Amino acid sequence: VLPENMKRYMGRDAQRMNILAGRIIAETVRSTLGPKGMDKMLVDDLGDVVVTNDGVTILREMSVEHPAAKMLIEVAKTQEKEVGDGTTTAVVVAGELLRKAEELLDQNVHPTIVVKGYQAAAQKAQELLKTIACEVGAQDKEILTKIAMTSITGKGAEKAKEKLAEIIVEAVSAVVDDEGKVDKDLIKIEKKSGASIDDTELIKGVLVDKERVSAQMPKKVTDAKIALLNCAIEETASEMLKDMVAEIKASGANVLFCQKGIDDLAQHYLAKEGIVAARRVKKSDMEKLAKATGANVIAAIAALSAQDLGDAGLVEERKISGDSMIFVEECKHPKAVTMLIRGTTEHVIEEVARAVDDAVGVVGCTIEDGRIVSGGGSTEVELSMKLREYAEGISGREQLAVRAFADALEVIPRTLAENAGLDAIEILVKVRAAHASNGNKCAGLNVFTGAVEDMCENGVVEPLRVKTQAIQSAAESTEMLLRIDDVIAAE
Amino acid sequence: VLPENMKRYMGRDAQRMNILAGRIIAETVRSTLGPKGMDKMLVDDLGDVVVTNDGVTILREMSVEHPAAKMLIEVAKTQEKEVGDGTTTAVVVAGELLRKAEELLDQNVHPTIVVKGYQAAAQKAQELLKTIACEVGAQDKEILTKIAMTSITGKGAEKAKEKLAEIIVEAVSAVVDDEGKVDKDLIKIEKKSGASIDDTELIKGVLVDKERVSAQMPKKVTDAKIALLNCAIEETASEMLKDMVAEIKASGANVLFCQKGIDDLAQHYLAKEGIVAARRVKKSDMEKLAKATGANVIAAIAALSAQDLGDAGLVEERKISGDSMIFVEECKHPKAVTMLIRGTTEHVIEEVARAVDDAVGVVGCTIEDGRIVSGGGSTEVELSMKLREYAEGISGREQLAVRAFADALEVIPRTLAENAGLDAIEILVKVRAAHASNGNKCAGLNVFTGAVEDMCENGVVEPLRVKTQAIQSAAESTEMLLRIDDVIAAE
Amino acid sequence: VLPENMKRYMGRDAQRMNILAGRIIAETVRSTLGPKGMDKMLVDDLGDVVVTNDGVTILREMSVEHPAAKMLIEVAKTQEKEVGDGTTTAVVVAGELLRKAEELLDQNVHPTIVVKGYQAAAQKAQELLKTIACEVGAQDKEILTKIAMTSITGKGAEKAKEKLAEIIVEAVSAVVDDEGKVDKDLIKIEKKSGASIDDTELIKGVLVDKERVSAQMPKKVTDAKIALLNCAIEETASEMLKDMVAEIKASGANVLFCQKGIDDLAQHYLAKEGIVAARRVKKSDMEKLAKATGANVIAAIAALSAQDLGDAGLVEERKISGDSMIFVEECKHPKAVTMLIRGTTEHVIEEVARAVDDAVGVVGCTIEDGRIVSGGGSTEVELSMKLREYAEGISGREQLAVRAFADALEVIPRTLAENAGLDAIEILVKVRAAHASNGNKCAGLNVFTGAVEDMCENGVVEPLRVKTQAIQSAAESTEMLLRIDDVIAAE
Amino acid sequence: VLPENMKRYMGRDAQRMNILAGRIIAETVRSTLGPKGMDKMLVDDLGDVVVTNDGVTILREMSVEHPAAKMLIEVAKTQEKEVGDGTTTAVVVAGELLRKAEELLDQNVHPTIVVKGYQAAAQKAQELLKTIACEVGAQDKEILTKIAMTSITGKGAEKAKEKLAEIIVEAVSAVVDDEGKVDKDLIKIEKKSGASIDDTELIKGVLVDKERVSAQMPKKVTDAKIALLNCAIEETASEMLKDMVAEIKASGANVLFCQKGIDDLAQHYLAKEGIVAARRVKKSDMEKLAKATGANVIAAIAALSAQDLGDAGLVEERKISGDSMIFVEECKHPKAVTMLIRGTTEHVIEEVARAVDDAVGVVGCTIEDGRIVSGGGSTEVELSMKLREYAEGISGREQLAVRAFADALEVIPRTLAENAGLDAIEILVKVRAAHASNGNKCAGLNVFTGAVEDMCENGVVEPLRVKTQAIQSAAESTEMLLRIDDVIAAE
């Protein structure tokens, strides 16, 4: 039926096969866990080399075959859609949770007991997270930079984490509009090598990596009237093409962004009419320009009127690290901003671009949801403490799964310290002792100095939503696996 | 003749081969039997992963080769066409019934005796079901929610089974029209992630997952005049295309649903005329809109007149979980309603969508047929009791098959308790003892607590039709097999 | 010469090969012999599963290779063309007749003797059948239902054999026209699941499984003027297509049956003119409609005139088991009727449809030929008795073949009782004893109770033609084989 | 040079190879020899099964490879072209004649002696046949039915040989025209199942298996004006096609036979003009109709005039065994007649059709040549007697071949009696004794009773031409072989 080399497992072997498939990914990602964790280099058939620490990105780029690992990927994609960050943590938690479930199955605990115990403990776990959640001001500069920096740290770019936090916090508050909802789509991530990471700046306008199509055209336009055409400026015969250019002139437009190309013949006439133009404009760029300038993207020139033109106070061609780019600024009511990321190398600012793509997200989450929690594994410990007590009240066979559920959380405090090169046993004893006496607001592990520390005092915090989503996704994906006991695959 | 690997059986081996083919499916489905049963993950050649408990769906998606299993599938499809739910139960009953038939053949009971005895006992079985059938009010809220919840339970979504029963009972009574017949086609199943299961609501109108094709177009239309065109709004030259748009305007239409695409050039002119439009409308959507608004779907614009326009009090673009959808509501006499299913994950509400597709069905059956019966295997036990007495009066060789027929019903009480992890022997003794003394309205097994209970008191009931169809289909499909003694297959 | 695997026989081996080829089919069909016989499931390369007891149908669907079995098929097709029923009996009789012929060849009886003896005994056999033939009234309700029921019995549908006999007897007398000839082509066999077998009814008009192509069109037409066009209602441009519709209107036609499709544009204009239409009409349907309404099927609209329109008192769209069908009734002089077969399942009424296709045939034969005979093997016994006496008068070597010819008839009394599970020896002794003393009108075997009974008293009779055709075809096909002693096949 | 499997013989081995090749066919046909002989079933690659006794037909249908057997086939085709019947006899005589020649070659008789002796004896053999030839009246009813019946006997259809002889004798005398020559092409052989062999009748007119193309057209035409067109009645546009129909009407034609198709549009207009039409008319049918009616087959309608129309008193559509056929009768001077052959089965009248194709031939030969001879091997014996005496006068080595030539004739008296199952030795002694004493008009073997009888008294005779052609063809084809001593074949 199947290619010679392909193997099949069934019944209890299908269960172990599935846990092992989950173990392959879970083991792969848990080595990237933490600020002191490693990264993966994925190299495709075409020679494209992608180096990252992002779990779902690794899972999207690599070649995963087994359905079990493919449903794990779906969980990783949920993590991205909801939080962005914590892609590793989510898989690691679910990984150990599955290991504990398989140990229960080995201990002759019926799958219906494992499911019940997990779903029970997860319901209380989220109640406990909401109980220990610390309320903060949605627009508090301090916590806004604390959330941001938490994600930033453990990266080479953390040398400028103060500048990075500044740019992201301001960008979020800029685009939040009302009080409030943060739409990431209002902030563009633009990256150009040159200068360093400290130089990165937020530009309240639209910056595109385009130049003025002809050396004969003006290098700047003031009180700019922006026209957006998706139809190429290409017409046979210079008489009709000239009329086209005269029609663009007739609109009162001074700046022309064409999604498609512009014929060299048209570029001559466009220059004669004093019209500055940029061709081959990205679909995204056409949209950002419409958002900022209020320009209306027109299909057919016949539909283009003076009322379809957008406004910009100044559209100017500027050079950065030698490269000519167009800055669209001083717009009446720009609904888009551009973050210009600087750095010593393209590949460095490629990492920064992704790092801040997350940071700008989690800061927005912190504003939208005014509950944050301490990091360094403090919450996971709190949950281990209280759920162990709950397990005793629950009793029966269910107490077996509930105890394992709570204990599963210890893979994070442990593997974190393991990647830090710390004593797995002693760290866990000293952290749990310090947590138990001092509290959750006086705990967690600082792998940066290699000692138990007050994570909250040190500004090591993360949104409640991140923590509760991690529990939600992990628990329901574990139950998902547990619900399946028969795999029917086509050839 | 046949590919090396393919095997052939003949005569008595063809009989055993056929029973074994039926055993393969019957064994596969009986593991999914009950609220505490498992589910199957079917993964095709393209990577599509489908996780379900539905028997016929499993049989449609999987690759079945043997003609015997393919005719079993036809039985499973009959179960869907008639009842929807109970796809597993029907196969399991028929499975054991075939096993009992093969035991009779082993006991040297002529196939004509097995057929006669089964057809005889099945005739009395349906008389017995009609005898024990409990009459209920067709519009009794209580029994309507009891039928609904019976199907709902054993699912993760049962946490909100009260909300789900509420939505389905109201939806059925809404579309029933006269007293009465329930047409499922009048209720749309729409599912969008966001919120939870408690939030699911019934919208007396038509909701489609479409947006306003241009940002320039109005976001809502009051006293809406809906036009339905299946011809794409695509015409070479802006003069003729403009005339087309002017012709749509001429109708008095304000809302335009086009089954095909709308050219960007047309979208400009449509906006200029204040016409709101949605393109690429699904064939189903074009029909639901015609049903609700009374709009007449027009092929050629030449045929479109003002008399072909449908009415809606308000057609409005609303965002749900960020996604823009069109709500068509306040129609004069809407003949279609939309059930908007909410939940924390797309894959969760994918299961809810199917769960309520059945629930809305069986509630409609309960209204149309005012007879319901107790669940938990109580009927199957009653039948075992009375048919054993009947068997004694029948006598001859026929009594052998009649006794086996009645005993075959015990696979359900047994496998149910087996999936529950209960004592197969003791449960059956305690249930049959409790049934015999207390009655059928004071019996059945509650696998939810793992004890014999009053299923009727607990609202664990199902339509008589479900139970009688299970007997009808199983008995005639067993006889079908029994009638065939020679398999003639092409290469 | 031939593919490795293919075998060749010659001379006396060609004779045995041919008898064995005849034995393969004869043995296959004799297991289906009788009301208590079995059926065959034929499954082709495409997955099509056909379950039947009809001999020629089995022979048409299966893959027969040997020329000898292919000429046997030709005999089976003659049986269908003449009688319809008795497809098994004919082959079984010929099968044993060939076995007896091969025994004679083994006994060193020259093929010219075997041929002479068979042709001699067959000439007297038909004289004997005409001698014992019982004359009945051509329009006697009683014998008409007896002939019908004889064919019907031994089927699951026999539970309603009284309703079925009623429908067929009335349908035959309805279409017989003069006194008389019954043309089966005047009775349509239509089958729709829903209800049961008792509900089957005869509709003196034409019922087609078509709906009203548009929801805008009238759902019924009174004093209907039916138009029949085989040209599709498809014309480029709405001006010419409108003129086409106006031309149909001009005819005075109110109902339009188009053999081909109808363009959606035309469906709009057709509705505007109040013309009801059905497209994709089957070639057969176009003919039945012409027969009933007297409508003239027109190729080109140019040829269509008001004189070409047929009449129906009422053409109405009605729903049955939910499905929309068109009933064409109250026609002035309908020359076609439709039998609407009801039942609990499509596959059940698929069997009923074939069962009554035969029943309506043999009743027509009984009317056309006023001679019928008793069943249960009574005639075959009578023939064994008298031909044994004739054999003695004939003498010589010819008497050897004549004795074997008469004895060959015993395969039917025997295999019938064998399929019934009765004593092959004792049954034959008790039947022949009862026949010899009481007569042919006081004999035959009742396999329904498993005892010798008066088949005539019990209404177990069949047309003389059936019995005499069985002898004619079997004898001449045996002689056919006997005449061939050399097989010359191409590669 | 040649495919592995192919063999080559040379010199004396080429001679034996050639005799063996002739023996293969000669042995194959001699089993079909006589009224009590067998037949052959030839089955091709497409599944076509042809059962016959005709030698040349067997040789045409089978696959013959060897050049020697292929030249034997040419002899068999000469037999058909000249006589028709006696295809077996001719080969058998030549077969033994070749065997006797090979025995002579074995006896060291030079091929020049074998040739000389055969050519010598064959010259006297034909003189002897003309000497014993019995003169009969060319139009003597009695001998005309005797010749006919001789060919007819030994067939299942001989039960009606009196009816068959009647039809053929009348048909021949009908078409003979002058005194005389019989042209078989003037008699059509038409066969339709239904009725029996006694019912076969001769229709002095033309019967074709065609119907009236439209139900709207007249079913009969009196004083019919027949038009013959080989151009299809197919014209784009109804205006030009109508003019075409009007042009046919203009001719005065009432009946139209079109060799090609007739468009449905034309069939409408043809009916409106009262023109009856039949399409797809066979090329042969177009010719027979021209012969009978005197109608002139026209290519282009432009060439069709009123003078080209043929006459028939009545052209009428009649049903036979249900099938609609056209009878063209009462023509002024019909030059064609149709023999309508009836019978219980298509395959039976397929044999009758060929049987009478010969019978009508040999009766014509008997009229054209007023010499006939006795059958039953009487002539062959006479020749053995006289040629033995001649051999003695001839002497030398030539006498060896001449003796063998005469003795070769004994294969017919012998193999005939062998197929009859009679004593090969005793029969030949009793026949030769009876012949020698009583004469040739008082001899021959009657295989029908299995005794020597007076063949002439019993009406067992055949045309002299048949007998003399058998000698001519056999002798010259033997010499042909004898003349070749070297076979040069291409790869």
mmCIF file of N, CA and C in Angstrom, chain B residues 18 67-68 70-71 74 78 82 110-112 119 123 230 296-300 302-303 305 308 472 476 479-480 482-491, chain C residues 28 31 36 38-45 47 49 51 58 62-63 154-156 159 216 238 263-265 268-269 272 344-345 347-348 418-419 421:
data_model
loop_
_atom_site.group_PDB
_atom_site.id
_atom_site.type_symbol
_atom_site.label_atom_id
_atom_site.label_comp_id
_atom_site.label_asym_id
_atom_site.label_seq_id
_atom_site.Cartn_x
_atom_site.Cartn_y
_atom_site.Cartn_z
ATOM 1 N N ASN B 18 -17.768 -11.927 3.486
ATOM 2 C CA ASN B 18 -18.741 -10.823 3.566
ATOM 3 C C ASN B 18 -19.054 -10.376 4.991
ATOM 4 N N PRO B 67 -17.168 -4.754 -1.964
ATOM 5 C CA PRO B 67 -18.588 -4.496 -2.286
ATOM 6 C C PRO B 67 -19.485 -4.600 -1.046
ATOM 7 N N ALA B 68 -19.141 -5.528 -0.147
ATOM 8 C CA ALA B 68 -19.919 -5.758 1.089
ATOM 9 C C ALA B 68 -19.884 -4.542 2.021
ATOM 10 N N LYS B 70 -19.090 -1.566 0.930
ATOM 11 C CA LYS B 70 -19.735 -0.507 0.085
ATOM 12 C C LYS B 70 -21.246 -0.566 0.202
ATOM 13 N N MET B 71 -21.871 -1.674 0.316
ATOM 14 C CA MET B 71 -23.324 -1.731 0.559
ATOM 15 C C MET B 71 -23.702 -1.377 2.006
ATOM 16 N N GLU B 74 -23.967 2.296 1.944
ATOM 17 C CA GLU B 74 -25.292 2.683 1.430
ATOM 18 C C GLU B 74 -26.338 2.724 2.546
ATOM 19 N N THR B 78 -28.335 5.975 4.079
ATOM 20 C CA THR B 78 -29.792 5.967 4.345
ATOM 21 C C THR B 78 -30.090 6.553 5.730
ATOM 22 N N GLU B 82 -32.377 9.887 6.297
ATOM 23 C CA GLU B 82 -33.569 9.799 7.151
ATOM 24 C C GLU B 82 -33.430 10.498 8.504
ATOM 25 N N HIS B 110 -30.244 -23.170 7.931
ATOM 26 C CA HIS B 110 -30.368 -22.768 6.521
ATOM 27 C C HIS B 110 -30.658 -21.256 6.415
ATOM 28 N N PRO B 111 -29.940 -20.565 5.526
ATOM 29 C CA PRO B 111 -30.129 -19.135 5.272
ATOM 30 C C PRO B 111 -31.605 -18.722 5.140
ATOM 31 N N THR B 112 -32.451 -19.592 4.611
ATOM 32 C CA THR B 112 -33.902 -19.299 4.519
ATOM 33 C C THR B 112 -34.583 -19.219 5.898
ATOM 34 N N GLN B 119 -36.880 -11.484 9.775
ATOM 35 C CA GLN B 119 -37.905 -10.640 9.158
ATOM 36 C C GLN B 119 -39.102 -10.720 10.082
ATOM 37 N N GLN B 123 -40.575 -7.485 12.391
ATOM 38 C CA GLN B 123 -41.986 -7.041 12.256
ATOM 39 C C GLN B 123 -42.638 -6.793 13.622
ATOM 40 N N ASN B 230 -26.553 36.996 -11.731
ATOM 41 C CA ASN B 230 -25.538 35.944 -11.873
ATOM 42 C C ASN B 230 -24.524 36.225 -12.982
ATOM 43 N N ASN B 296 -35.470 38.458 -7.295
ATOM 44 C CA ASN B 296 -35.476 37.513 -8.420
ATOM 45 C C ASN B 296 -34.115 37.525 -9.107
ATOM 46 N N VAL B 297 -33.481 36.363 -9.086
ATOM 47 C CA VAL B 297 -32.151 36.179 -9.685
ATOM 48 C C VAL B 297 -32.273 36.297 -11.208
ATOM 49 N N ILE B 298 -31.556 37.230 -11.737
ATOM 50 C CA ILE B 298 -31.671 37.533 -13.175
ATOM 51 C C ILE B 298 -30.364 37.122 -13.864
ATOM 52 N N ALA B 299 -30.545 36.474 -14.999
ATOM 53 C CA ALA B 299 -29.426 36.108 -15.879
ATOM 54 C C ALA B 299 -28.885 37.324 -16.630
ATOM 55 N N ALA B 300 -29.750 37.912 -17.460
ATOM 56 C CA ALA B 300 -29.358 39.013 -18.342
ATOM 57 C C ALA B 300 -29.981 40.289 -17.789
ATOM 58 N N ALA B 302 -30.971 42.734 -19.344
ATOM 59 C CA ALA B 302 -32.119 42.993 -20.213
ATOM 60 C C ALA B 302 -33.429 42.530 -19.557
ATOM 61 N N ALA B 303 -33.356 41.367 -18.901
ATOM 62 C CA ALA B 303 -34.480 40.798 -18.144
ATOM 63 C C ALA B 303 -34.745 41.478 -16.792
ATOM 64 N N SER B 305 -35.762 44.009 -14.165
ATOM 65 C CA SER B 305 -36.693 45.129 -14.021
ATOM 66 C C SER B 305 -36.842 45.464 -12.541
ATOM 67 N N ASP B 308 -38.235 42.905 -10.154
ATOM 68 C CA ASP B 308 -37.348 41.777 -9.818
ATOM 69 C C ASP B 308 -36.532 42.023 -8.546
ATOM 70 N N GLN B 472 -35.438 -1.116 10.898
ATOM 71 C CA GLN B 472 -35.824 -1.311 9.485
ATOM 72 C C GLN B 472 -34.600 -1.500 8.588
ATOM 73 N N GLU B 476 -33.250 -5.236 6.968
ATOM 74 C CA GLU B 476 -33.329 -5.389 5.506
ATOM 75 C C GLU B 476 -31.950 -5.472 4.831
ATOM 76 N N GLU B 479 -30.786 -9.116 5.643
ATOM 77 C CA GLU B 479 -31.482 -9.989 4.683
ATOM 78 C C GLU B 479 -30.893 -9.835 3.270
ATOM 79 N N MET B 480 -30.564 -8.589 2.910
ATOM 80 C CA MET B 480 -29.883 -8.295 1.639
ATOM 81 C C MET B 480 -28.634 -9.173 1.468
ATOM 82 N N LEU B 482 -27.852 -11.864 3.210
ATOM 83 C CA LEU B 482 -28.307 -13.260 3.270
ATOM 84 C C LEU B 482 -28.873 -13.800 1.958
ATOM 85 N N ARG B 483 -29.477 -12.897 1.190
ATOM 86 C CA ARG B 483 -30.012 -13.220 -0.143
ATOM 87 C C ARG B 483 -28.932 -13.472 -1.208
ATOM 88 N N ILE B 484 -27.737 -12.932 -0.997
ATOM 89 C CA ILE B 484 -26.610 -13.084 -1.944
ATOM 90 C C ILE B 484 -25.695 -14.237 -1.484
ATOM 91 N N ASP B 485 -25.460 -15.163 -2.400
ATOM 92 C CA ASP B 485 -24.612 -16.346 -2.111
ATOM 93 C C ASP B 485 -23.534 -16.561 -3.185
ATOM 94 N N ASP B 486 -23.394 -15.592 -4.079
ATOM 95 C CA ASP B 486 -22.483 -15.689 -5.222
ATOM 96 C C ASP B 486 -22.086 -14.283 -5.671
ATOM 97 N N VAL B 487 -20.792 -14.033 -5.623
ATOM 98 C CA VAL B 487 -20.212 -12.726 -5.981
ATOM 99 C C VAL B 487 -19.478 -12.874 -7.318
ATOM 100 N N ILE B 488 -19.965 -12.143 -8.308
ATOM 101 C CA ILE B 488 -19.373 -12.136 -9.662
ATOM 102 C C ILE B 488 -18.774 -10.751 -9.941
ATOM 103 N N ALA B 489 -17.464 -10.658 -9.807
ATOM 104 C CA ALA B 489 -16.754 -9.374 -9.949
ATOM 105 C C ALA B 489 -15.917 -9.361 -11.229
ATOM 106 N N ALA B 490 -15.884 -8.192 -11.863
ATOM 107 C CA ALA B 490 -15.030 -7.941 -13.041
ATOM 108 C C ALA B 490 -13.568 -7.777 -12.599
ATOM 109 N N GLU B 491 -12.649 -7.945 -13.533
ATOM 110 C CA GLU B 491 -11.217 -7.807 -13.185
ATOM 111 C C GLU B 491 -10.937 -6.494 -12.459
ATOM 112 N N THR C 28 -24.663 -22.316 -12.369
ATOM 113 C CA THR C 28 -24.750 -20.959 -11.804
ATOM 114 C C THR C 28 -26.208 -20.509 -11.665
ATOM 115 N N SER C 31 -29.011 -22.504 -9.055
ATOM 116 C CA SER C 31 -29.020 -22.049 -7.647
ATOM 117 C C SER C 31 -29.979 -20.867 -7.379
ATOM 118 N N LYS C 36 -37.783 -19.896 -3.702
ATOM 119 C CA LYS C 36 -36.875 -20.088 -2.554
ATOM 120 C C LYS C 36 -35.395 -20.150 -2.962
ATOM 121 N N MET C 38 -31.787 -18.483 -4.659
ATOM 122 C CA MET C 38 -30.936 -17.337 -4.277
ATOM 123 C C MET C 38 -30.804 -16.331 -5.421
ATOM 124 N N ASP C 39 -30.013 -15.295 -5.177
ATOM 125 C CA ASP C 39 -29.665 -14.309 -6.214
ATOM 126 C C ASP C 39 -28.158 -14.062 -6.299
ATOM 127 N N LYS C 40 -27.773 -13.354 -7.345
ATOM 128 C CA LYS C 40 -26.361 -13.069 -7.655
ATOM 129 C C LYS C 40 -26.072 -11.570 -7.590
ATOM 130 N N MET C 41 -24.907 -11.259 -7.046
ATOM 131 C CA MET C 41 -24.387 -9.881 -6.980
ATOM 132 C C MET C 41 -23.222 -9.732 -7.965
ATOM 133 N N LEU C 42 -23.477 -8.996 -9.024
ATOM 134 C CA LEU C 42 -22.495 -8.690 -10.078
ATOM 135 C C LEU C 42 -21.934 -7.282 -9.889
ATOM 136 N N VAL C 43 -20.624 -7.215 -9.766
ATOM 137 C CA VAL C 43 -19.922 -5.953 -9.449
ATOM 138 C C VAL C 43 -18.872 -5.705 -10.537
ATOM 139 N N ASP C 44 -19.060 -4.627 -11.280
ATOM 140 C CA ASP C 44 -18.181 -4.318 -12.429
ATOM 141 C C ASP C 44 -16.916 -3.544 -11.990
ATOM 142 N N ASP C 45 -16.130 -3.166 -13.002
ATOM 143 C CA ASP C 45 -14.849 -2.444 -12.825
ATOM 144 C C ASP C 45 -14.997 -1.004 -12.298
ATOM 145 N N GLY C 47 -17.425 -0.100 -10.119
ATOM 146 C CA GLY C 47 -17.994 -0.155 -8.758
ATOM 147 C C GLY C 47 -19.508 -0.387 -8.733
ATOM 148 N N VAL C 49 -22.802 -2.064 -8.556
ATOM 149 C CA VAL C 49 -23.273 -3.318 -7.926
ATOM 150 C C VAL C 49 -24.725 -3.604 -8.315
ATOM 151 N N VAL C 51 -27.617 -6.513 -8.185
ATOM 152 C CA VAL C 51 -28.092 -7.722 -7.481
ATOM 153 C C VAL C 51 -29.406 -8.142 -8.148
ATOM 154 N N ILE C 58 -27.932 -11.478 -15.687
ATOM 155 C CA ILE C 58 -26.672 -12.000 -15.140
ATOM 156 C C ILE C 58 -25.681 -12.326 -16.270
ATOM 157 N N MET C 62 -22.289 -10.080 -16.527
ATOM 158 C CA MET C 62 -21.049 -10.846 -16.314
ATOM 159 C C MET C 62 -20.212 -10.888 -17.607
ATOM 160 N N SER C 63 -18.986 -11.354 -17.460
ATOM 161 C CA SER C 63 -18.059 -11.504 -18.601
ATOM 162 C C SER C 63 -17.929 -12.972 -18.999
ATOM 163 N N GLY C 154 -42.187 -15.276 -3.983
ATOM 164 C CA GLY C 154 -40.767 -15.591 -3.717
ATOM 165 C C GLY C 154 -39.902 -14.332 -3.605
ATOM 166 N N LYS C 155 -40.578 -13.194 -3.497
ATOM 167 C CA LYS C 155 -39.946 -11.870 -3.418
ATOM 168 C C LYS C 155 -40.398 -11.220 -2.109
ATOM 169 N N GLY C 156 -39.545 -10.338 -1.571
ATOM 170 C CA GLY C 156 -39.867 -9.587 -0.339
ATOM 171 C C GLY C 156 -41.159 -8.758 -0.484
ATOM 172 N N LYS C 159 -45.593 -9.418 0.026
ATOM 173 C CA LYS C 159 -46.458 -8.929 1.115
ATOM 174 C C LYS C 159 -47.624 -8.072 0.599
ATOM 175 N N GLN C 216 -40.732 31.383 -11.080
ATOM 176 C CA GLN C 216 -41.635 32.450 -11.563
ATOM 177 C C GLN C 216 -42.793 31.925 -12.436
ATOM 178 N N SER C 238 -30.805 38.712 -26.966
ATOM 179 C CA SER C 238 -32.136 38.661 -26.326
ATOM 180 C C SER C 238 -33.281 39.100 -27.233
ATOM 181 N N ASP C 263 -32.016 28.148 -22.129
ATOM 182 C CA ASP C 263 -31.105 29.191 -21.620
ATOM 183 C C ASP C 263 -31.838 30.005 -20.534
ATOM 184 N N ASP C 264 -31.115 30.370 -19.482
ATOM 185 C CA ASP C 264 -31.680 31.190 -18.387
ATOM 186 C C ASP C 264 -32.345 32.480 -18.865
ATOM 187 N N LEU C 265 -31.802 33.033 -19.955
ATOM 188 C CA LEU C 265 -32.393 34.230 -20.567
ATOM 189 C C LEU C 265 -33.791 33.959 -21.143
ATOM 190 N N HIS C 268 -36.572 33.438 -18.420
ATOM 191 C CA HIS C 268 -37.130 34.727 -17.994
ATOM 192 C C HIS C 268 -38.304 35.157 -18.889
ATOM 193 N N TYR C 269 -38.098 35.090 -20.202
ATOM 194 C CA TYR C 269 -39.116 35.551 -21.165
ATOM 195 C C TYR C 269 -40.307 34.605 -21.247
ATOM 196 N N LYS C 272 -42.480 35.387 -18.470
ATOM 197 C CA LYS C 272 -43.203 36.633 -18.791
ATOM 198 C C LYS C 272 -44.411 36.410 -19.708
ATOM 199 N N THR C 344 -40.456 1.645 0.544
ATOM 200 C CA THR C 344 -39.655 2.221 1.649
ATOM 201 C C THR C 344 -38.211 2.585 1.264
ATOM 202 N N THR C 345 -37.694 1.980 0.187
ATOM 203 C CA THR C 345 -36.321 2.217 -0.297
ATOM 204 C C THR C 345 -36.228 2.087 -1.826
ATOM 205 N N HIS C 347 -33.821 0.956 -3.647
ATOM 206 C CA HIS C 347 -33.320 -0.370 -4.069
ATOM 207 C C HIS C 347 -34.365 -1.482 -4.018
ATOM 208 N N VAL C 348 -35.370 -1.283 -3.168
ATOM 209 C CA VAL C 348 -36.503 -2.217 -3.067
ATOM 210 C C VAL C 348 -37.429 -2.053 -4.282
ATOM 211 N N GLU C 418 -34.563 -29.165 -4.092
ATOM 212 C CA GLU C 418 -33.224 -29.081 -3.498
ATOM 213 C C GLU C 418 -32.992 -27.685 -2.896
ATOM 214 N N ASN C 419 -33.374 -26.653 -3.644
ATOM 215 C CA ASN C 419 -33.305 -25.260 -3.146
ATOM 216 C C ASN C 419 -34.274 -24.990 -1.986
ATOM 217 N N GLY C 421 -34.844 -27.326 0.221
ATOM 218 C CA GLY C 421 -34.228 -28.101 1.315
ATOM 219 C C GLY C 421 -35.030 -29.372 1.628
#
